[PDB]
Symmetry: C2
Subunit: 192 residues, 2 copies
Amino acid sequence: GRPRAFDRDTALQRAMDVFWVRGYEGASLAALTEAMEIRPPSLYAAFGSKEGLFREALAHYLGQHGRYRRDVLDGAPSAREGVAELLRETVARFTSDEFPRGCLVVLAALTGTPESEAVRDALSAERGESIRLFRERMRRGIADGDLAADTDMEELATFYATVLFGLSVQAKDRVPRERLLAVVERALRAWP
Amino acid sequence: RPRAFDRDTALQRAMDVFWVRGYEGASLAALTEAMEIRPPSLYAAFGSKEGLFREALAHYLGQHGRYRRDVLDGAPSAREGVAELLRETVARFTSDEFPRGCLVVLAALTGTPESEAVRDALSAERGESIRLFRERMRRGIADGDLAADTDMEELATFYATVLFGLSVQAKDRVPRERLLAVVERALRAWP
DNA sequence: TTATTTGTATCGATCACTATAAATTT
DNA sequence: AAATTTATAGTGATCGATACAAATAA
């Protein structure tokens, strides 16, 4: 067939930014096409629909802005330092001038119309993973000796995931990076 | 002609639609069908979808935001104030009488530029949450249950962060026991 | 062919919102 | 009657999603 006249991954990144800022439903087809510099028929050719475009953009976001999460967790000598460096780097990215403020998974679709309930549920599932990720590192901690064997791994994981989701909301509110880092250290104070 | 609907009950229904669907996600169809009124009546009473949301937000704050300051000021220490506030808030977030999560956090975090006002409004209210903590801690400094050199803005922001995160978690159907454990864990960070 | 993409033109449905007039009070 | 609030029906605009034919490949 005719060769594609646009980079698919670049269009995915630009569609991902529009979602990151306006949310799944707030990002209209007009705003998407104007940012991806393509036309609606070209979009539906490639991606399939707004829902499908968002699922590809979320998969792309998790592979580009979700890699550092597991990398800094497993790259620390202790589970506490893993959680510490993860929260610090997550605040650095939430407050960086290169990326939109906050996490896409948290801000994109918390509520909305029934039509998007699938998208919403999808994001919810990903938030669940944010807990499991924490838990897994803590598990390794228990094996490494830096964490007690009887610690409630899912309680700590849920707590630090709660702090993570709260940090997205605070970063959307333009809370200074210094105060968000102070919040991270305060949250680390709650470690057993 | 007498109006065929009570304004406060219509605001109740409208705020429920906003609580589940958010500001832009709540269409006029879903709003009018829940309030059991017609679009001309809605626009004569409130003037605009944004006006309806502002009235519903004021009503929601007078109904589900008045207890915050009362529970904070009703405790002997700032620690117990924050503790009982978080525990009560979890109890409401996990009850089946109200939609799970706080409306101020869930209604509009992102959206179209056209709704910038609404979002900013909610943001302001979120700020007040921090203030509600800060003020109490100030009293805690005077009463002597909090150190004078306590970094209040870090502590207030931390517990407000936990509060906003609890709204998100309550939306994700996290059980009440898990959220209560999260609160008791967040209290361990207290100085 | 045989197939696929691209730009122009939309499609019906739904959005927030309202002009007009009947209905219901004093 | 006079003063409001309804209900009907529909406003332009925009929503996500497409025909259609020209355009570019195997």
